[PDB]
């Protein structure tokens, strides 16, 4: 048996073009109420670009990658988690860092190739199961890979409705 688990995460896909992938990220702030939020890019170049382009249209981001400095790496999620900072860019990282209550919607801006990347990224430790959402955003093209995985992980990843339903992902305390 796996260590993550994804009960208690509803996942959500949308199907989107690449070059319209920044215009559905800024539909999913209008729409969701997002509390703060991770979202997870296939490189460090697209973590860095996805970024600035964030924060040029008048959002609240840091970023941390692979790349960067390991002591960098934490005390920037250190001042993500403190709540100086509304959304955090990561690209793929081996070494996890602590849950963050204020976190509830974890989006997918570039799909993970397999299954053990996408349960690094969505699954949770413990079996305590604090409520989240998380999106994919997806290419039609590679809509196959998100069914081998779904199957792989044995879970439901579900075509996002134009409403989510707030009982998944706002905290009711």
């Known amino acids: 048996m796996e260590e993550l688990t994804l009960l208690g995460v509803t996942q959500y896909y949308a199907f989107v073009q690449e070059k319209q992938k920044v215009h559905c990220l800024n539909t999913l702030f209008r729409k969701l109420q997002i509390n703060q939020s991770i979202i997870f890019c296939n490189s460090t170049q697209r973590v860095e670009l996805l970024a600035k382009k964030i924060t040029e249209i008048g959002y609240s981001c840091y970023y941390i990658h692979s790349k960067m400095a390991q002591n960098h790496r934490n005390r920037v999620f250190h001042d993500f988690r403190q709540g100086n900072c509304r959304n955090l860019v990561c690209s793929d990282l081996l070494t996890r860092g602590i ?21 690094h990224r969505i699954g949770r430790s413990g079996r ?18 998100l069914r081998r995985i779904e199957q792989e992980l044995r879970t439901r990843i579900e075509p996002i409705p134009k409403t989510v339903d707030p009982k998944l992902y706002v905290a009711d305390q």
């Not at 204020?102 to 190739?113: E, G, H, L, Q, S």
């Open 99 to 119: 849950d963050i209550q204020a976190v509830n919607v974890v989006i997918n801006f570039d799909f993970p190739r397999n299954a053990e990347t996408y349960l």
């Open 128 to 145: 305590f199961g604090h409520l989240g959402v998380a999106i994919n955003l997806i290419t039609y093209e590679d809509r196959h890979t």
